[PDB]
């Protein structure tokens, strides 16, 4: 059907790759299988190798590298790729170890990214940026400050963009009057070789009088729209300056991402609920 081609300015070397996003099922990553097309004259003696970088940046903390000899020799998609090219097309096949920082970066260089590097040399080039990706596979909180605050969420998996509905129940038996209620989202993106991130904040002047019950639902939605002027924000892997989502919620070695909805009463008893913010597999 479709395949990604890339060759050097000399073009003597080409790499054909089925995908440029690799799905980490958490037990078997989509193996990086591609095909190297070469001309015998431009290589002659020198060998040809292909490498799978697992860089970590911020600093080039290249957390992993592995080499495959395109030539000398050492799948059906590779078969079909070869049938159109001949002998001088040779397959490479890396297997991604799962325990890698799944493709993520930071919104401005920094970040994390795999890479397919094909090069011809006698001894140990096309630079194909790839990514590892993960697809999305009932928190409840009660606090008794008596100023009782209870928060709940419909479910723990909220697709990117999908709005989050927070059930708030405030039983104010104390003498302090609530001046605001804030349902906010904190996006914890810890660079482990963690920071509070205010993205969405539905501040409502919903005041609950003494010995009174205030029960209702907020709807707050995290969107990249207003998260544009947020440096250090964790985005998903950007292949060549596209645009992408908010760094999906990691399912736990590099950058760790979690998300929490914080219900805070401005009297400041606060509670928090962790939720998942990953895409759905089509």
């Amino acid at each position, epitope marked *: 059907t479709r395949v990604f081609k890339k060759s050097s300015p000399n073009c003597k070397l080409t790499v054909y790759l089925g*995908k440029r*996003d690799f*799905v980490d099922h958490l037990d078997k990553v989509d193996p990086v299988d591609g095909v190297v097309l070469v001309d015998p004259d431009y290589l002659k003696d020198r060998k040809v190798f292909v490498t799978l970088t697992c860089a970590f940046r911020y600093f080039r903390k290249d957390l992993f590298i592995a080499n495959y000899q395109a030539f000398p020799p050492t799948t059906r998609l590779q078969e079909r790729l070869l049938r159109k090219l001949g002998q001088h097309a040779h397959p490479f096949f890396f297997t991604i170890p799962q325990n890698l920082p799944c493709s993520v970066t930071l919104q401005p260089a920094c970040g994390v990214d795999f890479e397919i590097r094909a090069f011809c040399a006698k001894s140990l080039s096309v630079r194909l940026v790839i990514r590892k*990706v993960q*697809f999305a596979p009932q928190p409840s909180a009660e606090t008794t400050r008596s100023l009782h605050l209870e928060a709940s969420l419909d479910k723990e998996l909220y*697709y*990117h*963009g*999908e*709005p989050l509905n927070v059930n708030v129940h405030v039983t104010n038996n104390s003498t302090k009057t609530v001046k605001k209620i804030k349902v906010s989202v904190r996006q914890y993106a810890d660079i482990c070789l963690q920071y509070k991130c205010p993205v969405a904040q539905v501040e409502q002047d919903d005041q609950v009088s003494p010995s009174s019950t205030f029960c209702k639902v907020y*709807t707050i*939605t995290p*969107l*990249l*729209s*207003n998260n*544009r002027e947020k440096r250090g924000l964790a985005l*998903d892997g950007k292949l060549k300056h*596209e*645009d*992408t*989502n908010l760094a999906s919620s990691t399912i736990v070695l590099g950058i760790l991402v979690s998300y929490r909805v914080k219900v805070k009463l401005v009297v400041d008893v606060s509670v928090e609920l962790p939720f998942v913010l990953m*895409h759905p597999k*089509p």
Partner: antibody
Amino acid sequence: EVQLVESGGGLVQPGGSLRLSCAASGFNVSSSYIHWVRQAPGKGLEWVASISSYYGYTYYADSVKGRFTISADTSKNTAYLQMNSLRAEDTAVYYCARKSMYHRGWGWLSWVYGAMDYWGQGTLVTVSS
Amino acid sequence: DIQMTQSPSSLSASVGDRVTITCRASQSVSSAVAWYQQKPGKAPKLLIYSASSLYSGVPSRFSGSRSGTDFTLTISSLQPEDFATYYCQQSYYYPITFGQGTKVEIKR
């Protein structure tokens, strides 16, 4: 199943204004580029404008720029098109359809603006002094 | 903008005909074209995306393909029910543009 519900159609003198609501079911205003198109009386389609929430991306036709302004409300899962300075030519039946940002295989394809594949039923927009 | 010119302005054909409408993009396009079959009154429908991808539910008699900036839409068996106007639209750039429709009349 996916639907758009188009409403907000009634008379308006030249230079007046209108607001169009497109309530989205089966999807979100944030995982979709929502497009408002219009067909003049017995004439050919013309894409008016479209938006994406997740990015706050907005696009308008050259002849419907400034006069129109699109946005949305993800609380109710709805899209809104504010048509200001409605003029005689603007008359049409106005339709609402959407470009699902999905189908990239994994995530949002921010650079397709693909085919408007789910059309509503279209509300008649008039302009007459 | 991008003047997505279309031809013919209107064509005549009865049941069983093999209709062919040619949509040429003044500027380059990269398989971004859609052909909308608007009946009189009802709202446009999707037929073609990618210049050649059969949208789900479109009868298999419908098809299209790309030959450069000249995309083309073909209807193997122009049934009595598939009469409408057919607009071609470059969904590639912004501002989007549609064709100018090619009414498929009936013949007598």
